[PDB]
Amino acid sequence: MEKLVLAGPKGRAKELLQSLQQAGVVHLETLRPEALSAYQLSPEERAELRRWEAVSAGAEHTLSLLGLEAEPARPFPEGLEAAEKALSPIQAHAEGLTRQKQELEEELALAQAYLEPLERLAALAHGLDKSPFLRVIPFLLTEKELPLVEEALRKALEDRYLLAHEAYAGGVPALVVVHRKEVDQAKAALSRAGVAELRLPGALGELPLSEAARRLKERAEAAPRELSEVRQHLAKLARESASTLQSLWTRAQDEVARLKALEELASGRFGFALLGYVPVKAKPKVEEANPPWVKPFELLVSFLNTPKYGTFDPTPVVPIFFPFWFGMIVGDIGYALLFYLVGRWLSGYVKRNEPLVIDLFALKLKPPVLAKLVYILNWMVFWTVVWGLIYGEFFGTFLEHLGVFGTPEHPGLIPILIHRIDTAKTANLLILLSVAFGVVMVFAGLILRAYLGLKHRHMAHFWEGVGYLGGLLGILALAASYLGNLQAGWLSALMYLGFGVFLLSVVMSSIWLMIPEIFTQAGHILSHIRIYAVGAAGGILAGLLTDVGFAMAERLGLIGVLLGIVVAGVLHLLILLLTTLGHMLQPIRLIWVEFFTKFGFYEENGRPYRPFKSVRETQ
């Protein structure tokens, strides 16, 4: 029976216990810090740990050069000595080749720039680079520059000089021949003009010109063939040993985590620490612990198991998200009913988009693993696109059929030839439908706000959640009078007054020295309304722009527009596509009002648990 010591926080002592019991563990006992301070690494342990990181480093280093870094779940179990022996030739070979290839490219670059200048300059000073008699100065001239230079030399150096030049492929590299001790006269003339000397880097420059010129030529010629050799070798190493580097990194990495864990236990700073024994079979288990709703619901199960407050776990969040999210596509012939294509790319596999090839092998813009993690989301994106197609047929209930409006059941050009959602009232009712869902979400949050202090036993939050619902009576009163118009207005001026007292009554037990901030709490209500409203109005608006896009915008609206309208269609389409991507951000902006500004949820100025954005990202 293998012994384990496990540690974690005090808050989740119970939750840890419970995960463990289900997993299979027996003999659980709590430990005090004296018992934890006994497991301090030793010089032999620490020496292996520095070394294990050294393997980890060497692996990243070499693998990055051969291709791309990634780490597979599998390890390859070996001793240290074995690890050190496998990496050392593989690293040596990669290290040599990447320097050799870089050296060749730099080398080739110099040879390419300067073969013709040095060749021209060498010929010019043939035998003149080692005769004591004469001194030569090489320098670069451009065509425009040459007359000035020539005059300038001639005043400096009289008529006891030879200036000859040959043309490389621009201007000329020019060479002046002067007597030794009239060297200074010639250099002064160039310096004064602003003409710099021509030479090569390092040793090659120092060597006579001819030697340099012949070599340079030969290196321009030779380098691509040497570069081809080194590249082949580098590829053959990459095909065979990319996989091995990845597996050595994985074994070392686990081992690093293991040893670091132990040193971290040793200081005994952990709150809750447990002792237990597991059987051999048990030892693997102990350490571990309809498609539209159930599939994302399955991932919410890991967060069901973990509560950190007296508020109920963030499981309801996903069905609250769904109506508004689905309801973001409600366009016509030109948007919603064509959206089908867009869904099929992500949940299926096409070649149409470049980084998407076989989605079945998880190939995306995103990393291959990451794409596998958001398969669940891809399915929900598909359901989103499909629910968007249906709300296209919803849309054509009020924009087509002769049973609902006078608009043709089949137009003579293309479906959705007329728009009847251009009448203010028809459009308004769908807006007012969304607004209602926002009132509900305000209620959902405010029950959740209050619940936190109920099961966490914190009075301040409790008082805030109950008192705020007083405000809700007053929101619903005022609303009835605006939604039905002549419904209240005298039955919510009198009643409003007893509704306002409920608003603050227990808020004053809580104290609250942000009395003005209640304008912003009403504002938060107004933000859920204004976001559902935009999702409705902006939804219909996208479609009404298709009125002069896919129907009719040319001639008299005769039959020929069918094959003329596409002129406009191609332009609008993409513009529309771009702006409706902005409309799908309205959901997560909706969650952030409530989630991130405290109404029963963790978030508000940091705090434990992770943002709902990172949670829904996979779901």
Partner: protein, 62 residues
């Protein structure tokens, strides 16, 4: 579990250690008898020369 079991794993290494330190406690008595022995082999032998000499002297005189 292990508890007193783990302390009987110590009580085993420190009997390993105790056999080594009973292997000094054997070596001391061994080097002490192997020593003593040569000192009475020496005492016997010295007296013998000095007793062979005592009789030869008393012979030559007699």
């Amino acid at each position: 579990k292990l508890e007193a079991i783990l302390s009987q794993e110590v009580e085993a290494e420190i009997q390993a250690l105790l056999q080594e330190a009973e292997a000094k406690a054997e070596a001391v008595k061994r080097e002490a008898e192997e020593k003593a022995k040569a000192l009475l082999q020496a005492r016997e032998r010295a007296l013998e020369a000095q007793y062979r000499a005592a009789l030869r002297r008393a012979e030559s005189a007699g």
